[PDB]
Amino acid sequence: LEPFYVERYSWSQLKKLLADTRKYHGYMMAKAPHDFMFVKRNDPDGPHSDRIYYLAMSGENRENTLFYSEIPKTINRAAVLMLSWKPLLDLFQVGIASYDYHQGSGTFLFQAGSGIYHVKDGGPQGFTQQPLRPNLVETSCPNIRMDPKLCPADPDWIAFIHSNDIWISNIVTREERRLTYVHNELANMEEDARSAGVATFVLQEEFDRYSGYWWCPKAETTPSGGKILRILYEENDESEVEIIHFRYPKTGTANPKVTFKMSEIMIDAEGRIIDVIDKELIQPFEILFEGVEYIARAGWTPEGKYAWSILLDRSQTRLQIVLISPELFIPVEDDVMERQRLIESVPDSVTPLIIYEETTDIWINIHDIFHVFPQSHEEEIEFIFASECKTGFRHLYKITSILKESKYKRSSGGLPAPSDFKCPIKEEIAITSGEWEVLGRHGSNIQVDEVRRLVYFEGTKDSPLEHHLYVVSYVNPGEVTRLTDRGYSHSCCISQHCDFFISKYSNQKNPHCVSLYKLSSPEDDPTCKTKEFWATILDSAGPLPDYTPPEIFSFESTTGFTLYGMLYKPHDLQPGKKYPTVLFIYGGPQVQLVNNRFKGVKYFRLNTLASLGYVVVVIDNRGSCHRGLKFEGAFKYKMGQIEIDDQVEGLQYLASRYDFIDLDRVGIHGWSYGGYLSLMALMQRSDIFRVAIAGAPVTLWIFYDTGYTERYMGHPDQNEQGYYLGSVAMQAEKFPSEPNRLLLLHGFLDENVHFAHTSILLSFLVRAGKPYDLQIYPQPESGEHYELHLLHYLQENLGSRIAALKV
Amino acid sequence: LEPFYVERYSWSQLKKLLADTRKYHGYMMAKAPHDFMFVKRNDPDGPHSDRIYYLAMSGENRENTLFYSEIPKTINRAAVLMLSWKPLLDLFQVGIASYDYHQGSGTFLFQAGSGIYHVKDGGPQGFTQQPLRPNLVETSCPNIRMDPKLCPADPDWIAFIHSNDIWISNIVTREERRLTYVHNELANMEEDARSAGVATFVLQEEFDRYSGYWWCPKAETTPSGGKILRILYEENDESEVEIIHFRYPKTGTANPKVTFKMSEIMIDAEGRIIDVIDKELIQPFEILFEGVEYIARAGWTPEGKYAWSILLDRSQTRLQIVLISPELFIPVEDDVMERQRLIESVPDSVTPLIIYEETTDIWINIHDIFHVFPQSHEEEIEFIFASECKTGFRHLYKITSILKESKYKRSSGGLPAPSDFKCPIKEEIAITSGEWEVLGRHGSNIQVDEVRRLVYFEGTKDSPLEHHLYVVSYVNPGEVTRLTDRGYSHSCCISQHCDFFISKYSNQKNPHCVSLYKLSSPEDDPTCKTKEFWATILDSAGPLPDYTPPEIFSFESTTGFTLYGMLYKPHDLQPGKKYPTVLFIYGGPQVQLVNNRFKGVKYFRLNTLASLGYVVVVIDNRGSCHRGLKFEGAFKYKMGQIEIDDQVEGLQYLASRYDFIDLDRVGIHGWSYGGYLSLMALMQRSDIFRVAIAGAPVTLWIFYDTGYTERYMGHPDQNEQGYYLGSVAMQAEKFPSEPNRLLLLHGFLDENVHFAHTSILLSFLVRAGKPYDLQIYPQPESGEHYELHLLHYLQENLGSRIAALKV
Ligand SMILES: *C(=O)C(CC)(CC)C(=O)Nc1cc(CN2CCN(Cc3ccc(Br)cc3)CC2)cc(CN2CCN(Cc3ccc(Br)cc3)CC2)c1
Ligand SMILES: *C(=O)C(CC)(CC)C(=O)Nc1cc(CN2CCN(Cc3ccc(Br)cc3)CC2)cc(CN2CCN(Cc3ccc(Br)cc3)CC2)c1
Ligand SMILES: [Cl-]
Ligand SMILES: [Cl-]
Ligand code: NA
Ligand code: NA
């Protein structure tokens, strides 16, 4: 077996090769249709049953905007119907990321650039046949308005954030009122570190929560003829949180001081504000919710009788679903005389209600699944929730909880015990089960059909390489019925009326498609669900000829799990020759790289590496996503210690199976946790790995945030050895004494993994007498430079003939 | 002619080679004896005429401290007397950079670490024969005290800076009093940006002025029996000066707002403070000193009748020597009623006195030469000054100026004209002349013998490669007499009594020596000066065998100047072979690299390069030091444009003269302006230069300070093209498209040439699609890493066989 050497291109020739083969900019295709919504026409004489609204990007150099399409009552089943995209909005006098809608009025609300706009379609006023003009919500606010939301109780009112405070605005009367006076934009960021209605850094970055306020969905009527609207909101104080060059709670240090507040808004009979009463909790947040760090999720019950909240402790091993009555809130009064009367006036029976609680030795994984049924009995609440805590796989559970009067009484003048607010669980039926998970993140949710008493959900039952749509009953659970076709992975939106679903689907060979599917039952059994192809929304471009996709492989690991991987064979594969191998890696939690999805957009350059004569390998090691909580928990307290074993094991599996892998010329490369592991690979296994290109590596776990690090590694005092061994900066001495094996890539203004990680690693590498190569990216045309430098670095120090002579 | 290839050592082998050959740490030898002072014994029966005091480092791992040595009345001229070093101070209960002394009391004052200390020797109390105990000046000041100075009028009092304010302290009574209340350490650096008695950044960095206050050398007696002491001081406001991550006035932006203040200190008959009156100028600084940016130098006349100051304009093309009477200062009064009486009470004849003024089209070069003779007539002042403005070479001039009453009268209530304070010049004799300069920087000054009416000075008369001591009359100037021996460069201290001088001397082959020389006249002519070797103070270690020094060469440049250089021939020079060449460069103003001095300490690694088989070249291009103002002015408004022409010219001179220079493998390398020029070399002349290693390069002249940039390049608006063409960051497109030719080295916390220069160059290189290599030094063991990486980089991309195959 002779070694294959890649063609030694010049820097200009590589720049040319990259530019000629490039087809997407910023690793981004035009946004496929998303954020679907079905509205019924209700026109017996007309040809259409529904109108669907959705956000999409019409072309490559185009802005994301609202379109609609017509769903016909019948179809020509010999033909294939391609639904035409009708633009909902007219061109402006600036792209839309999301939108709101109020079923009963037709009112859309959305932000596009600086403006907040609205239109009407599909309410009482009917359905347009031409693009509507977006109506600007006018303002006297100087700065950009963020996070607009329609009030579901009254579609004339909206709320939004401006300079970290909550405002409301009427789109008909033009009235505009500030609700919170927590932040003062004249005062500096060190003194005034408070905010209302806004999720702080860790909650956005690590818990995927981007909003901090929620409208009450119903309006309390007043005797006068007017009403009371309500906004539940989070209020954060970040004074004690560490500063960096904004507020970044690094692991071990303080998180924000948080609480719930409520804004009570009296409107008169003609939509004019009478008064605004800002209301705080009756007792402090620390007393009523013992041991809670993070407000993970929040909202209201369907009838708006209670506010709900999913709450976590600092260790992220205890979740609590807690109902909060509006009566727990009293007006803010710095006068202690009036305040004391308000505390005593609120009943003792009015108390927080912990309707659910769960624990784990691994960690809680927050998701977006939580459905509350209409309240039939006064002293019971019925909901569906998902959890990994019973069986180690995320499954749906229907839970009924009893709303007891609490044993703790506030009149006694003491503090409540740890479990005085715990509601008894009457019932707890398992809706799904097995060695597979329900998906509750990244758009995956559930659609509950309350009529037929079913629940649609996404899951990994057929395969961990494919997401599929399933349906099952929630009263008499049993037969789980797959609705999506095997051989693709699916991301699905189900109509609110539960008679259609859309699926965005792909596999390794075929690009993304979006298609509409009609749902129906057989006449003999309404429980049984079948689907029929109705129409195409987005048609695939087809298997483009210049991308050769990889093969999914697997191997039985000595760890006792099947580990999956991807293999890009070199193009023009020569007989009796061995090729240099690049291992692309991420390897951290909450990500799966290996599945039956199209990888020719984001990872197109793994194919480009294969075209030059590199074997490219990717392996989902233990800790990675979609394999259950036990598989994920493998590296608890042990980050860095187990990942490379699985990579090396999978690499040796391929070497014995394929003679064309040259194990003497193996490189490794990743970004973020991938960069971290690329450093760990060269440190621990320099026998295996010739070169490591670490992009934006975590080098020091004490420099990363609370929400992420503490979930997987705990508090630093309780894991002194894990933090030391897991931090590559502390082990600089263990890097190679050869140069041309280590390359560090990092941006200067990266606010996720700070440059500090790279610079402190550089600091200790220099003190340890070790060589490194470095590229920096200070503050479009630089993804070009990165790709260029990477090909050149691999060529010069791994792939080419010159590289072998260099050692 | 076959190419020689350097031995390809591994990274570990290079680290070993560097460690084995290393003999100094941080490019620093132990400090040779400096800051000399001669005190007469005045003991007719005893064997010694003088005691000399001086600062020195006794060994390598040792602190800089005060020693003394005994100068005998006679010597054994057959033998060579090596003076023993006697320690002046005892070990403490922490090194000394400088000291003060009060002739008439014996009082030394010095800072060592945090403490300010004092001892006595050589006054009325006599001469110790054993180490004295340093006496701590006690304090209630919390923070470190800076810049201590004895009051020459009263050796009981000192002054010092504490938290940017001037304090005084009595070393006998222990009284301690704050004089200025300008800075408040509780208030932050953005709000309170004021300071007193302290030179701001640009004055320290670019004008070598480190102090901002000066004691009046005489004490005004009061009727009571007490007296008045005076401190002239600079007061700076840096509010409008730009901030960076301290106050850095970048070119084009505002410098500090400056003025003169005076502290008047009434002491009673027993050394106790009665009162302290803080006094400001009668009219603003901007009115009295029209067009002055920088207070370059300041002090007092010998009798203390006037304060003096050397003042510059923003362009640094107009110097003014200005006398300032204490009567120009009035007490500070925010009450306008009392203030108005004080303004009218001061006479109109009391006015600033511009005793000298000069201009140039090139630039003024500040120096430390300024001697004022005792005032014989009431309306005349007599002084020696040095200047390049008459002839383009720095020469000494004796000037007599007439102290006129000013035509401008303050009672009129108008502002003064541009030239109303100009004093008529009665006389202006040239003391020296020719195509050579007097030296007035870096310790070089003049010693004026007022008895014999001579002046000792350092100069370049015998050679621009050697500094020498000369003497000449200042009444009847003529025969300039060299006192130092040819074949060495000399740095000299002359005794205050003008009967001895010490010289620290070296040449290319022999390390530094320090020797004492006795001065005397022939009996027939007191004007004629001769010298005799008296004793050795520091003996040279001798030509150490592992350093081969370079040869000084020269060549007649087409520019019309003789340009000098240094050549390190490769060791073990083989016949009929050509060697790779490294050009070491600085090339900026105010530096000369090429002279007859020992280069085996600071530039020892140029020899180490020669030992591996590199030709090392150094060339003093136009703009560099010690060749006159015309030679220096060559690159005015044109930095970057002319330097590399001279380097390439000198390189081609050597190539035609020596066949062993391989012009196909020429590298360039420098730090600071050298790094800047290394970038300019690869940009302009990639035909000549294969590789460029730029250390801490200036890449953008608008990012550098006012004092330096504007002196050589003017204000950016008046030189738009020079700034653009001189800034390498703006011309990233002109760098090579080949990799392995450009290497950038920069510290992260460099506060002279900021990292910003490198990062913005990196920014534009990435946008231009250009390759670079980078090493960073974030925040002893790293000069090791730099040297290691440089040898390896030259080896891999210039010197070795692998480097030639790589292209
Ligand atoms: C990790 O999670 C983070 C996101 C938080 C970093 C902490 C991450 O994913 N980073 C990441 C970085 C890059 C590199 N780009 C960063 C931005 N930079 C902009 C810029 C602007 C101005 C200047 Br002067 C310089 C730079 C451009 C560079 C890229 C990616 C995306 N992945 C890269 C790897 N890729 C596979 C692959 C493999 C081989 C080759 Br050749 C090409 C691609 C998958 C996507 C993420
Ligand atoms: C230019 O004027 C400046 C001073 C203001 C820079 C703007 C300059 O002279 N710089 C300069 C830098 C170095 C390099 N050292 C910088 C400090 N650094 C400390 C450090 C601490 C912690 C860490 Br983690 C990293 C780094 C160490 C590196 C050196 C010098 C001195 N000259 C170097 C060149 N030398 C000749 C020479 C030639 C070849 C070889 Br091999 C070795 C030496 C002359 C002295 C100045
Ligand atoms: Cl079941
Ligand atoms: Cl003369
Ligand atoms: Na996120
Ligand atoms: Na200086």
Side-chain angles (χ1 to χ4, degrees), chain A residues 355-366:
Chain A
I355 65 172
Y356 187 72
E357 185 165 322
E358 59 177 12
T359 56
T360 176
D361 295 337
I362 304 181
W363 48 72
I364 301 293
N365 275 315
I366 293 292

Side-chain angles (χ1 to χ4, degrees), chain A residues 781-796:
Chain A
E781 304 186 314
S782 309
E784 295 167 27
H785 195 273
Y786 147 65
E787 285 174 0
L788 181 49
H789 189 90
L790 184 66
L791 267 45
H792 182 257
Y793 192 83
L794 293 169
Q795 179 181 296
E796 293 293 286

Side-chain angles (χ1 to χ4, degrees), chain A residues 27 584 586 602-603 605-606 609 669 671-672 696 750 752-753 777-780 782-783 786-787 790-791, chain B residues 763 766-767:
Chain A
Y27 315 96
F584 184 76
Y586 178 74
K602 199 168 181 283
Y603 312 96
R605 297 303 194 186
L606 302 189
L609 284 177
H669 170 55
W671 282 90
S672 317
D750 205 310
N752 197 326
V753 178
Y777 299 121
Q779 308 218 131
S782 309
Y786 147 65
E787 285 174 0
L790 184 66
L791 267 45
Chain B
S763 192
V766 171
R767 294 171 209 282

Side-chain angles (χ1 to χ4, degrees), chain B residues 636-656:
Chain B
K636 192 173 188 200
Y637 307 114
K638 282 148 51 57
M639 285 186 147
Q641 302 189 47
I642 72 166
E643 295 91 328
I644 306 304
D645 287 345
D646 300 329
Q647 296 289 318
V648 168
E649 177 170 24
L651 200 80
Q652 287 164 340
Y653 169 90
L654 295 167
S656 74

Side-chain angles (χ1 to χ4, degrees), chain A residues 8 11-12 15 737 739 748 755 759 763 766-767 769-772 774-776 778 782 785 792 796 806, chain B residues 8 11-12 15 737 739 748 755 759 763 766-767 769-772 774-776 778 781-782 785 792 796 806:
Chain A
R8 196 163 177 283
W11 183 267
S12 297
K15 195 194 295 194
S737 290
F748 221 79
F755 189 81
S759 89
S763 192
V766 171
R767 294 171 209 282
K770 302 296 188 179
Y772 65 91
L774 177 60
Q775 299 287 108
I776 281 174
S782 309
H785 195 273
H792 182 257
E796 293 293 286
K806 202 178 284 179
Chain B
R8 196 163 177 283
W11 183 267
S12 297
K15 195 194 295 194
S737 290
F748 221 79
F755 189 81
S759 89
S763 192
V766 171
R767 294 171 209 282
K770 302 296 188 179
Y772 65 91
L774 177 60
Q775 299 287 108
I776 281 174
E781 304 186 314
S782 309
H785 195 273
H792 182 257
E796 293 293 286
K806 202 178 284 179

Side-chain angles (χ1 to χ4, degrees), chain A residues 431-505:
Chain A
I431 304 166
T432 56
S433 64
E435 302 297 289
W436 58 270
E437 64 175 40
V438 176
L439 300 163
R441 273 300 205 85
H442 305 118
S444 299
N445 217 297
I446 60 165
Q447 189 65 76
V448 180
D449 185 331
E450 286 179 31
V451 173
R452 291 176 275 274
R453 311 202 299 187
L454 297 168
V455 53
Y456 299 81
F457 66 96
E458 287 169 55
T460 64
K461 194 166 95 83
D462 286 54
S463 170
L465 312 178
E466 293 183 350
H467 298 352
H468 286 280
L469 182 59
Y470 304 92
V471 60
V472 66
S473 175
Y474 64 79
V475 183
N476 291 123
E479 299 287 354
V480 174
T481 315
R482 175 169 46 78
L483 294 160
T484 40
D485 296 315
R486 288 223 66 188
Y488 308 102
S489 191
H490 296 259
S491 183
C492 295
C493 212
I494 305 94
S495 177
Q496 65 175 317
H497 309 282
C498 305
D499 60 335
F500 282 95
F501 75 87
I502 290 162
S503 177
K504 172 153 67 74
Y505 62 86

Side-chain angles (χ1 to χ4, degrees), chain A residues 12-26:
Chain A
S12 297
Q13 287 170 24
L14 282 171
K15 195 194 295 194
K16 194 79 176 64
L17 178 55
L18 287 166
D20 292 344
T21 56
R22 181 168 287 107
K23 52 182 74 231
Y24 302 108
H25 296 283

